[PDB]
Design a binder for this molecule. Sequence first.
Ligand SMILES: *[C@@H]1O[C@H](CO)[C@@H](O[C@@H]2O[C@H](CO)[C@@H](O)[C@H](O)[C@H]2NC(C)=O)[C@H](O)[C@H]1NC(C)=O
Ligand SMILES: *[C@@H]1O[C@H](CO)[C@@H](O[C@@H]2O[C@H](CO)[C@@H](O)[C@H](O)[C@H]2NC(C)=O)[C@H](O)[C@H]1NC(C)=O
Ligand SMILES: O=C(O)[C@@H]1Cc2c([nH]c3ccccc23)CN1
Ligand SMILES: *[C@@H]1O[C@H](CO)[C@@H](O)[C@H](O)[C@H]1NC(C)=O
Ligand SMILES: *[C@@H]1O[C@H](CO)[C@@H](O)[C@H](O)[C@H]1NC(C)=O
Ligand SMILES: *[C@@H]1O[C@H](CO)[C@@H](O)[C@H](O)[C@H]1NC(C)=O
Ligand SMILES: [Ca+2]
Ligand SMILES: [Ca+2]
Ligand SMILES: [Ca+2]
Ligand SMILES: [Ca+2]
Lengths: 488, 91
Amino acid sequence: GPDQRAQKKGDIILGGLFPIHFGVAAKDQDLKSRPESVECIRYNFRGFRWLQAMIFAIEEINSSPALLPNLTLGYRIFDTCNTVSKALEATLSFVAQNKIDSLNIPSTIAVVGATGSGVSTAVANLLGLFYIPQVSYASSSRLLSNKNQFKSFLRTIPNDEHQATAMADIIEYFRWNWVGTIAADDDYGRPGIEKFREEAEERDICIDFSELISQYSDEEEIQHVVEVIQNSTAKVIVVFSSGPDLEPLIKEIVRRNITGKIWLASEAWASSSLIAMPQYFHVVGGTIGFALKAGQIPGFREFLKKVHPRKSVHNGFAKEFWEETFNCHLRPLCTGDENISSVETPYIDYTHLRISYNVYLAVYSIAHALQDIYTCLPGRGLFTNGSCADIKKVEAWQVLKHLRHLNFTNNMGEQVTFDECGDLVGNYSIINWHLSPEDGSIVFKEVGYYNVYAKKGERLFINEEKILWSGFSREVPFSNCSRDCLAG
Amino acid sequence: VAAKDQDLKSRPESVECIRYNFRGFRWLQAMIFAIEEINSSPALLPNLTLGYRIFDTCNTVSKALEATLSFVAQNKIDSLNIPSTIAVVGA
Ligand SMILES: *[C@@H]1O[C@H](CO)[C@@H](O[C@@H]2O[C@H](CO)[C@@H](O)[C@H](O)[C@H]2NC(C)=O)[C@H](O)[C@H]1NC(C)=O
Ligand SMILES: *[C@@H]1O[C@H](CO)[C@@H](O[C@@H]2O[C@H](CO)[C@@H](O)[C@H](O)[C@H]2NC(C)=O)[C@H](O)[C@H]1NC(C)=O
Ligand SMILES: O=C(O)[C@@H]1Cc2c([nH]c3ccccc23)CN1
Ligand SMILES: *[C@@H]1O[C@H](CO)[C@@H](O)[C@H](O)[C@H]1NC(C)=O
Ligand SMILES: *[C@@H]1O[C@H](CO)[C@@H](O)[C@H](O)[C@H]1NC(C)=O
Ligand SMILES: *[C@@H]1O[C@H](CO)[C@@H](O)[C@H](O)[C@H]1NC(C)=O
Ligand SMILES: [Ca+2]
Ligand SMILES: [Ca+2]
Ligand SMILES: [Ca+2]
Ligand SMILES: [Ca+2]
């Protein structure tokens, strides 16, 4: 269907959905002419790295005599641009065959994606209409745990409830009671901020203001929000949002030089390069945020270094990647002899792999379900009368059934199992934004951890000695509505 | 719809609705009445006839999504490569 994709033929096809662009153009349609299309604007290198992770995992599986002998995996990977419409077009392309069959061409056995929660919901409706398994890597909303609506959804990322409980614990740990809240008006910010509100109500914490912001917000809403922020006495603000939806507000705040505010970040924008820029430090320095657990993929960087726009005939996204990396045309003209290590872009300038490891784990979980089908002993199956599933002709519902009961080993030696709701628990790390002494950029220094496996009250660990407040200070700030009443 | 849980030990089948709602039938009859009245009226849209195609949702996303997939067949096949519905009423 959609062009610019990355495709490769095989016996079994796996679909993909990755954000290669942050968003779409701001063109408005007055319906005077026939609506044509919307073009995407800002290239996202991190999404390209996630796509490369998926391709690398598939190629590794295709070269293993151990896993899936005599079977070759193909793929059809599209771009979503963090928008529902493009992902819906790609999903229609995916379910072409099943839709033609039911209502009255390649067949995909499973789909990997997507990043956003609204996009994932819109995709999951259509995919559960046909019982096609869908394993996401970055959707952490709690509404996707409802199995009476989403029947074939699984995720390799933890749920967002423990994160809100952890922010409540962090606020209680420093002995604050006067805070404010900001969330994104989507399926990711509202439930998390509601859970945080409940937890804060439990622990005797007063919330002054609560605002909803969006990437598609006009000047008036931003002015009102910044007036609300200026207009109060609280210095601690909890934000449940992502970088694209948070950029306008941060730009306006850095315009007005609003300083002295302590920010707590959710995992979405705790490492966002759209927010972690030098020109915002005096506003955003000293932020305390969450992060997932890093993983190791041996030989992945070497694969990342081998991109060349001419050799890769199975990846149509590499041309724009090269043009954006080296600023030429393949207004100078590209030669193809440049080196990726030269320019500093998020493609290979990374410290830990957190979402790429999720993509790797999702691909390997699908492969292990396929292997479990391929090794079914006679009369010892998970189907009626102990029957097995023919590996020569497989179907999406059998793969989903094997995914619901899966238990395999990682390369690092850990057990990966989905619960009854298709979720996977994990630890959290707590980081603080500092400034590089030499480079001058924002550095993410770990200050603690949150252990979801412990018991309540012993799940948090923080070193205050490593924490710089507002980026420079060593004294803990003061966020209380009123001063303490003493003896007498 | 019914509460039959899917064990996925056999090929999944379609789900069945349970209770009957007369208020929704009255709303459907209201739509049919409006269309017939418009057709009978000569001043409004002369020399043309208004048709319709109405389905059941059963307060479930899946049934309405199946009906909507039926609604956009021609546009879908045109974009990815039966009379078309100009407008939809619901849900
Ligand atoms: C700000 O207010 C909080 C109460 O919301 C104070 O926390 C109390 O601190 C005392 C002494 O450390 C404890 O005995 C109480 O149990 C705390 N109350 C709680 C946690 O709800 C805090 O001390 C105040 N800080 C300042 C600087 O005024
Ligand atoms: C999640 O965090 C806990 C807490 O740090 C980890 O528990 C540690 O486990 C290692 C060995 O696996 C021990 O050496 C440490 O002493 C433990 N720390 C404790 C108990 O505070 C745990 O391994 C992490 N990961 C998982 C999957 O639970
Ligand atoms: O559900 C959601 O919308 C977020 C999106 C998101 C998360 N982590 C990210 C890292 C980079 C980019 C986007 C994200 C967590 N789940
Ligand atoms: C903030 O307080 C000032 C003080 O009068 C007021 O003029 C302004 O309207 C207030 N803004 C908001 C958003 O409450
Ligand atoms: C903004 O605030 C910082 C911190 O006090 C100060 O150094 C800088 O001069 C201010 N800039 C403007 C334009 O007010
Ligand atoms: C998965 O298998 C391991 C054995 O390697 C077992 O210890 C573990 O309990 C299994 N998972 C579950 C959820 O039972
Ligand atoms: Ca193999
Ligand atoms: Ca996406
Ligand atoms: Ca980002
Ligand atoms: Ca008429």
